Amino acid sequence: NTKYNKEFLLYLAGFVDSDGSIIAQIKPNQSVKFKHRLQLTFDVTQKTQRRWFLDKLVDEIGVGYVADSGSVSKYRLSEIKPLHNFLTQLQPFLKLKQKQANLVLKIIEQLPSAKESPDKFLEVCTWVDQIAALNDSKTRKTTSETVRAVLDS
Amino acid sequence: NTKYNKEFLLYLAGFVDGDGSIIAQIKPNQSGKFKHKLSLTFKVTQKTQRRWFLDKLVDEIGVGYVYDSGSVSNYYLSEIKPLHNFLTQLQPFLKLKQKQANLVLKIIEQLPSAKESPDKFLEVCTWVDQVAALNDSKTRKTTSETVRAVLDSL
DNA sequence: TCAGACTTCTCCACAGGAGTCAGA
DNA sequence: TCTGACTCCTGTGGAGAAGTCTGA
Ligand SMILES: [Ca+2]
Ligand SMILES: [Ca+2]
Ligand SMILES: [Ca+2]
Ligand SMILES: [Ca+2]
């Protein structure tokens, strides 16, 4: 639970609203109770010639990782606890992605009670649909409906 | 001269380093001294669905305009005095585009003089080249060498 | 003549997902 | 059982130019 400098957070929020992404996903999984698991991700993308900027970001946030894919690189953070802490601090400064952040925070807090009632799980999956609805989603496959079809069994 | 709030400049700098562009151009221009007209632009691009976000910038910066192009909108500020004023205050907070901003400010200032000798003008054109070089430039046509071509000829 | 309002074009550099896998 | 690290892909939503056309 580290506390970030407020000027760092204001600049970072602007950069995230622009080149970043707050992502919620339902991923198929045979070994889990409801055959699906959730994955939340904070993401900043940038051409690989500017990877250094993403490197500095790892050091500043103090967690996460950079990966390369083609001519582009990404800072990523999916680890639940640090993510919940980070977004909680960034959230008030976000303008375009404030809702996505809030939905992700809500999802994380409900994670525990979501792995019990199939009905509660679906509810949380609906929060996921809402994040995707807010994003510029274009290649999405697995939704809360997908989960339903599967639960009906 | 409008003064801007600091927390505003901090967030905007981040957003500009992300979705923004600081652009220097040499444009043709028959009805002109050296047949090339200089043009500077600060710009922010966004899907037209989020045009409101750009509309607000017009109000917060206090000048500039929003226009549409396909599925996308842009905030633009080209007017030289306010551009100078705005970039001077933003520049301190920029991370990826700080050098482009300083070059634009440098060009704006050395402008009146750059319209004296074909050399002073041409030297400022090389400042334009640097901006483009620092940008992810892909569809550029007119450079300082395009200028030297029209000057070393006449 | 001229800066400044306004339009068009092109090539990515993002965003926003889909997955596989290995060690908890 | 399950999560978090890591890779790969699509389809734009950007960026970074290129231009035309007034008015004073
Ligand atoms: Ca963006
Ligand atoms: Ca959407
Ligand atoms: Ca960018
Ligand atoms: Ca470059």
Residue numbers in the entry:
A (entry chain A): 2 to 154
B (entry chain B): 2 to 155
What does the paper say about this structure?
I-CreI is a homodimeric member of LHEs family, which recognizes and cleaves a 22 bp pseudo-palindromic target (5′- CAAAACGTCGTGAGACAGTTTG -3′). Each I-CreI monomer binds its own DNA target region generating the catalytic centre at the dimer interface. This region contains two catalytic aspartic acids (D20, one per each monomer). The aspartic side chains participate in the cleavage of the DNA strands along the minor groove, resulting in the hydrolysis of specific phosphodiester bonds upon the coordination of three divalent metal ions.
To broaden our analysis, we also studied the I-CreI heterodimeric variant I-CreI_3115 (Y33G/Q38K/Q44K/R68Y/R70S/D75N/I77Y/I132V-G19S/Y33V/Q38R/S40Q/Q44D/R68A/R70S/D75K/I77R). This mutant was generated using the methodology previously described, and is able to recognize and cleave the human HBB (Haemoglobin beta subunit) gene (I-CreI_3115_target, Fig. 1c upper sequence) whose mutations cause sickle cell anaemia. To understand the molecular mechanism that inhibits cleavage when a G is at −4 position flanked by a pyrimidine at position −5, we solved the crystal structures of the cleavable and the corresponding non-cleavable variant targets in the presence of catalytic (Mg2+) and non-catalytic (Ca2+) cations. The MST measurements were then performed keeping constant the fluorescently labelled proteins and titrating the corresponding target DNAs in the presence of the non-catalytic cation Ca2+ (10 mM). This metal ion allows binding but hinders catalysis. To check this point, we analysed a superimposition of the crystal structures of both I-CreI variants bound to their target DNA sequences in the non-cleaved state.
